[PDB]
Structure formats: C-alpha cells, structure tokens
Amino acid sequence: TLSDYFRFVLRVGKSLYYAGELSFDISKLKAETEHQQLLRSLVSCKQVDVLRFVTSQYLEVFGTCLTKVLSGSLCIRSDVDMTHFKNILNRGNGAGIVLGSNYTLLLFTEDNNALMNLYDCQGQSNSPFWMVIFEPLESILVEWSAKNLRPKKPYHKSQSYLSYLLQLGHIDLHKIGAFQATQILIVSKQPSPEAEELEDTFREAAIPTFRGLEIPESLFLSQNVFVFLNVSLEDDFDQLQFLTLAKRKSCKFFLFGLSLPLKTYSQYLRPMFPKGGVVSVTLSALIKTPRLLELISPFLEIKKDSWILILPPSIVDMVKSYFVTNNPDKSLLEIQNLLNTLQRYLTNPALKNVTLYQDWDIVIDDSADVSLASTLQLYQKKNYDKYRRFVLIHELKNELTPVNGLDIVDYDEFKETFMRA
Amino acid sequence: ETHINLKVSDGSSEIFFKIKKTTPLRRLMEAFAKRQGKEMDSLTFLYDGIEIQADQTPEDLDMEDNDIIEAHREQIGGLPSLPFLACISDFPENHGTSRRSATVSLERVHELFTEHWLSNLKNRREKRQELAEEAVYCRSEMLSQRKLLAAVD
Ligand SMILES: [Cl-]
Ligand SMILES: [Cl-]
Ligand SMILES: [Cl-]
Ligand SMILES: [Cl-]
Ligand SMILES: [K+]
C-alpha cells in the first residue's frame, strides 16, 4: 500500500506475447476518496492483457461515454518487445483497450496527435507510451462489445435502416409485403410516435403515404393498398368512418405497435379482416322475408370455408316473443309452424357453417333489431382476426344507425351484391 | 406585460407556451409531459442550468419573454454507448478494421440492445403509451448513430 505505482506485466494479442513490465503513477488517486474500489483493483492487478483495439477517430466521436479518471505517461521497468507494440499502435492509428470489471484502460503512443489532445496528456514523459484510466462500463455492455462481430439478422442494402430497426423491434414490414404497396394509410390516436415513425419508414421507400382520421375516398382505389391501425385503436377501430369502404376496396389491414399482454408475421404486427365474413339476420328481416335462411342457404354453401351464418341460440323464442307482441291475437297453430322452420335450420346441422352466438356474446337491448345489430358489432370487435366482412340483413336499410366495418343491407341489396357470384 | 412566451425543448421538438407570470409551472410541465406520453416526474425541466420545481412561477425565476426551458429525459440503459461498443475490435496484429466492419458490428449491437430492451419490458412499471414513445426514441437514436458512423471521414 506504500507503493505509489501500478506495476504490471503487459501482454498483447491472441499470442499473448510479453511486451514488458510497466509502471503507472497512481499517487494522484490515493488522495482522492471516490475511487477506492477502483484503486484497490488497480493495485492487486499484476498483469494486463491488451486484446482489443479502437481507432483514434472512433474515440474522438463515440468516446464521450467513457468517464476519465486519470491519465499519465507509462514507465518501462523491463522492455521485452515494446518496440513492436508501439509500431502496431502507430500503424493502426489507435489505442489498445481493456474493458475490465473495475476499470477501463487505454494505451497509445506519443505519436498519436489525436489522443494526446483528446485527453490533455501533459507532464512528465517517462516513455513513448501513455495510458488513461476510465471508470468501468456496465457488465452487460462489455459483453455486447465482445459479441459485436456479426448480427443474427443481416441488414439489406436495399432496405432503409429505419425499417431494419423496426424489424429488430419485431415489426417486420417486409414479411407482410408492405413495401409493394401502391398506397399506405396510417391511423392512430394521439400522441402518435409510432404512427408518424411509420409514415417516415414508407416516405423513405417513396410509397405514397397518408396519415389521419379523415382519408379521401380516392386513396382506396389504388391496386395494392395497405391500412395500418395503431394498437391505440384496437378497441375503437369501429369508429373509423372509412372502414367498410376500405374492406370493399380490397385493402389489407394491420394492427401495429408495442403491446404488453402479460404486463411470417411479427409480434407487434397483426393482420385484420383477413378473409371471409359473417352474416346475421334481424327479426324485422325474418318476418319481412320468412324464407331468408333457406333462401341465402346457397350462398353459405359456396362460402362454406370462409363464411358462416350466426344466429342467437334464443332465436326461436325471440321470433315467437316478438310475434305475440306484434300480433297478440294471431293464432297459435300458425305460431308453432313458423317456429319449427327456424328450429329446423338450427337443430338439424344442414350446413356446417351455421353456428350459434355464445350466450355471453349477445348484447342486450329492448329492441331485438338493435340487439342483433349490436351483437354483430361486438362480434367484429372480438373476431376481426378471423373474418373480413360482417353483413347484417335487415328489413329497412336506413332504420339502424350504420356501424363502421359492417354492411347493414336489406335482402335485395344482399341479393344483388353478395349473391351475384 | 401579463403573459410571456416560453419555449420548452428536448433538443428535437419545441413547444411554445403563453402563461401568466403569476401561475405555477406545474401545468406547463405536466402539459409537455403529456404530449410525450410521459409523467411529469419522468422528465427534468431546467432553466439556465438550475432545475425547476412544480410550484416555482415565471415570476420567481424572473423569466423573460421568448426564454427557453430544457427538458431532459432520463438516460436509457447504455443506449449512448452503443456505437462505441461496435467500433472496438481485435488488436491489429495482421488485419485492419474496416468501416464496413464497424457498421456491421453496429447492426449486431443494435440487435442485442433491442432484444434486451424488449425482454426487459416485464420489469417495466411504465404504461404502454410511455414505453411506446421510448421504443421510437431508441430507434431514432440508433438510426442517428448509424448515420454518424458512416459519416466518419
Ligand atoms: Cl426497439
Ligand atoms: Cl392518425
Ligand atoms: Cl415496438
Ligand atoms: Cl439515452
Ligand atoms: K384498392
């Protein structure tokens, strides 16, 4: 402890050849009190292996993250091969570096104009070499620095680095063919850091890009349109006025953004309204057109793989109820006959794509039509991952307030548009 | 006379405020924080080197029209050290480092940092909205590091 000098053997490179024994004046560190933990390590150290290297230019620009503690001229007690060690530093135009647990060392020659100034190296010249001691870097960092050779996921010259970073962040826009779009549409609540970062990504690719709640109808007409909804709209996306039009126009939809559930595609990038669709009917419709189910049955056959018809389990008791209400003095024998038809279309699994709402799926309302329209709306919110279109056949077209993403059509409309195929 | 114009900036984004000299800056600080999905305590506002508390008024600090307030986000892990970690290489016994070898290294370092930041999200108590703005901040910073590395003359 009486020693004023940090004395060590200097070995270099993969061969760990011995360059010599050196000394470093640390007496200016013994007066201090902040770096006792550091000084104790310096003293007990008797050997220093210089295996890594960094150029002067890189130090001048990215070296400020280092915290300088002490700098001075090294003293050579023994010279085994210091000449060579000097030559390599000079040819490399940089400094050898050691990322220790308790300290960080830089070793360079006096010929290094750059580093002599970058660290105010003045005073006694004990030899051609100079050293600087910095505070250690976080264990985790030094570890990365050693594994800094090559990335697992390579960056492609043709992609913008901005997208590559998103890629690393588990938002792989290339996997979903985003960069072949003819138009990008971006929507989000505020503040919208991600949405406008996304705009940037695509503006870099020179793809026409628009962001906002109010999108002009003309932007959906392009050949390959992409619609990106930010996660902040995962529960309100049915408030976007343009949603149904978008679906009609063959747009591709995606949820994007950081999400924390526990707290091809990627984790923070998700498809919406992929294919197919759901069709449901209102009581007002079943009465205007009793044949409905057996009348749109053929459409369901064709779309047996991507479509389904969905009725509430209490649909028979629902019609009956509203049939008595509407017509209190209507005969009962007729009642059973109408009901048997529905029960038959449900009881007998004629079509495999005829499912029943779950009991907890039905949204309650005094009006059956409003109830069924609201249940389908809730179904879109919970199944936007399985089906694209959500169509509700209803007696009077302008009787129900429109739901974004849904098609509220009467039979004739459904007949000319959907059944024409 | 009664009001003054102030500029709150974090180096990248500026916002102007019109407020009485007699009102606590609590509202101005909490407003700025909101636009970044941040809590007011998640930042540090300082005028002329000194920090500002939630009760000090422009009358106290004796602020003047068209003055500035610097907001400083709390440093994110070892984000600022990333490019330096990539520049480090083996001691040049025979070979010499390449500028392309550094960018390729920066790619790996940017990758390690990201994977670590994402994995670290369980330990984060912050809200979704705030962590989102941070992830975007990280990426824009990493992007800036890349442009700076390739700019080395
Ligand atoms: Cl990220
Ligand atoms: Cl938006
Ligand atoms: Cl993210
Ligand atoms: Cl930072
Ligand atoms: K289209």
Curated annotation (Swiss-Prot), chain A:
Chain segments annotated as coiled-coil in the UniProt record: none
Domain of life per record: Eukaryota
Cell compartment(s), UniProt: Nucleus; Cytoplasm, Cytoskeleton, Microtubule organizing center, Spindle pole body
Assembly behavior: Ago1, chp1 and tas3 interact to form the core of the RNA-induced transcriptional silencing (RITS) complex. The RITS complex interacts with the RDRC complex via interaction between ago1 and hrr1. Clr4 has a role in mediating this interaction. Interacts with dri1.
Known function: Component of the kinetochore which plays a role in stabilizing microtubules and so allowing accurate chromosome segregation. Has a role in the RNA interference (RNAi) pathway which is important for heterochromatin formation and accurate chromosome segregation. A member of the RNA-induced transcriptional silencing (RITS) complex which is involved in the biosynthesis of dsRNA from primer siRNAs provided by the RNA-directed RNA polymerase (RDRC) complex.
Protein name per Swiss-Prot or TrEMBL: Chromo domain-containing protein 1
Organism: Schizosaccharomyces pombe (strain 972 / ATCC 24843) (Fission yeast)
The gene coding this protein: chp1
Residues of the full protein shown: 515 to 956 of 960
Curated annotation (Swiss-Prot), chain B:
BP GO annotations: protein sumoylation
Top-level taxonomy: Eukaryota, Fungi, Dikarya, Ascomycota, Saccharomycotina
Organism of provenance: Saccharomyces cerevisiae (strain ATCC 204508 / S288c) (Baker's yeast)
Ranges of residues in domain Ubiquitin-like: 2-78
Protein name listed in UniProt: Ubiquitin-like protein SMT3
Position of the Glycyl lysine isopeptide (Gly-Lys) (interchain with K-? in acceptor proteins) cross-link: 78
GO-annotated cellular components: condensed nuclear chromosome; nucleus; septin ring
Subunit structure: Activated by a E1 ligase composed of AOS1 and UBA2.
Similarity comment: family membership: Belongs to the ubiquitin family. SUMO subfamily.
GO molecular function: identical protein binding; protein tag activity; ubiquitin-like protein ligase binding
Role noted for this protein: Not known; suppressor of MIF2 mutations.
Keywords, ordered alphabetically: Acetylation, Isopeptide bond, Phosphoprotein, Ubl conjugation pathway
Note: Present with 2940 molecules/cell in log phase SD medium.
